Amino acid sequence: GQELVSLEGHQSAITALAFSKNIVVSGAADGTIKVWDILTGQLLRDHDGHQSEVTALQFKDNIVVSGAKDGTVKVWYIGTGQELVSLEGHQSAITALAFSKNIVVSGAADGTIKVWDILTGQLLRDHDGHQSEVTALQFKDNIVVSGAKDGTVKVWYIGTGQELVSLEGHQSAITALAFSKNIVVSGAADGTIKVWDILTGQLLRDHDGHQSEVTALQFKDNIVVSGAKDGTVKVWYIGTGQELVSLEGHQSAITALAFSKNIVVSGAADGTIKVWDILTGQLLRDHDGHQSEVTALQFKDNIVVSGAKDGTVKVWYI
């Protein structure tokens, strides 16, 4: 349970983080984007980003999709950092990104949602998504599910361009989403978690949650992991709302969550990173990760990658 590598990090707060293969892409509030090789810990690509704060990152098959505060959306190659396609982006700040096959879906602070083809650069769909800032976005199988700061959740089809079903949403800002072919599950800031039949729109379950002011959510299978400002990390079943295991949490506000296999990695505003086993509830690791708030966590193949508000990027083993 030590550090794999030292990484130089950035000169400003880490705002986005992506992890794939042995490559980590990190974005900072000064617009700089850096690419690192985990095996050697060397910075391969420097200054490939934007001129405003990086707000979202997507990394899939040697291609990085990055969004910035000025609304720009860039698609470039990790090998050379040269942009592949030119996207006009949004006029408002990018707030959410989804990347699947050749499609990029971007959400902005004005509520707009745009669908791009990263082979032609064409704007496939221009959407007046919500009357509020798009705070979450999930893309799967030709259908987009979005969440906004006003509590609204929406799903639509890319070709038709109209909504498939009307979901009532929440009454606080949405935090994280996920959905299957049959159901949608969404969670808001006040702890609410709701599941929706996509066809009819019916509310199959309405859970009030166990926390006040959640700051991070993570869905996988029917298990939700929720962190809150009070420092609690809770694991429970979305079908019934029953808590599964008890975790000590942190003495500081939860600011990042990662979830892989049966391992939960949580980061707090004091920089501490904790590693839990949801089968037993025991604390596997208790790292004094960073000296500032943990702003991003990536967890793949027993390797945790973390970023902090001081610009540091660390990578760990379990």
Number of Cβ within a 10 Å radius of residue 20: 16
Measure the CA–CA gap between 103 and 41, rounded to whole angstroms.
Answer: 31
Q: CATH number for the domain including 2?
A: 2.130.10.10
| 61 dihedral zone (left: phi>0; alpha: psi -120 to 50; beta) | left
Partners of residue 8 on adjacent β-strands: none
- Three-state DSSP class for 15? strand
279 Cβ contact list (under 8 Å, min separation 6): 245, 262
What technique was this entry resolved by? X-ray
Measure the CA–CA gap between 54 and 93, rounded to whole angstroms.
Answer: 10
Measure the CA–CA gap between 61 and 242, rounded to whole angstroms.
Answer: 38
Measure the CA–CA gap between 193 and 213, rounded to whole angstroms.
Answer: 13
Kindly list the distances between the CA atom of residue 97 and the CA atoms of 2, 10, 106, 270, in Å, as whole numbers in the listed order.
32, 22, 5, 27
Kindly list the distances between the CA atom of residue 307 and the CA atoms of 237, 284, 293, in Å, as whole numbers in the listed order.
29, 20, 9
The backbone torsions φ and ψ at residue 314, rounded to the nearest 5 degrees and listed phi first, read -125, 150
Element (H, E) at 34: strand 33-37
> What would the two tokens of residue 112 be?
């707009």
Kindly list the distances between the CA atom of residue 162 and the CA atoms of 60, 136, 197, in Å, as whole numbers in the listed order.
28, 19, 18
Number of Cβ within a 10 Å radius of residue 64: 27
> What would the two tokens of residue 102 be?
């050749």
Nearest to 140 by CA among 182, 110, 169, 168: 182
- Three-state DSSP class for 145? strand
The answer to whether 148 and 161 have CB atoms below 8 angstroms apart is: no
Return the beta strands (E) in 109-152 as ranges.
112-117, 123-128, 134-140, 143-148
Measure the CA–CA gap between 202 and 198, rounded to whole angstroms.
Answer: 8
Cβ neighbourhood burial of 291 (10 Å; 0-12, 13-18, 19+): exposed
Measure the CA–CA gap between 154 and 253, rounded to whole angstroms.
Answer: 29
Partners of residue 266 on adjacent β-strands: 257, 274
> What DSSP state is assigned to residue 274?
E
254 Cβ contact list (under 8 Å, min separation 6): 215, 216, 227, 228, 229, 231, 232, 233, 266, 267, 268, 269
Measure the CA–CA gap between 238 and 157, rounded to whole angstroms.
Answer: 26
Partners of residue 239 on adjacent β-strands: none
Number of Cβ within a 10 Å radius of residue 92: 17
Cβ neighbourhood burial of 190 (10 Å; 0-12, 13-18, 19+): middle
Measure the CA–CA gap between 37 and 214, rounded to whole angstroms.
Answer: 33
Measure the CA–CA gap between 123 and 114, rounded to whole angstroms.
Answer: 7
Cβ neighbourhood burial of 277 (10 Å; 0-12, 13-18, 19+): middle
221 Cβ contact list (under 8 Å, min separation 6): none
- Three-state DSSP class for 301? coil
- Three-state DSSP class for 21? coil
Which residue carries 């996920």 as its tokens?
Answer: 178
Amino acid at position 313, single letter: V
Question: Count of domains in the chain?
Answer: 1
The answer to whether 15 and 30 have CB atoms below 8 angstroms apart is: no
- Three-state DSSP class for 287? strand
Partners of residue 43 on adjacent β-strands: 36
First to last CA, the chain: 5
Nearest to 48 by CA among 40, 38, 59, 39: 59
**Domain of 305, in residue numbers:** 1-318
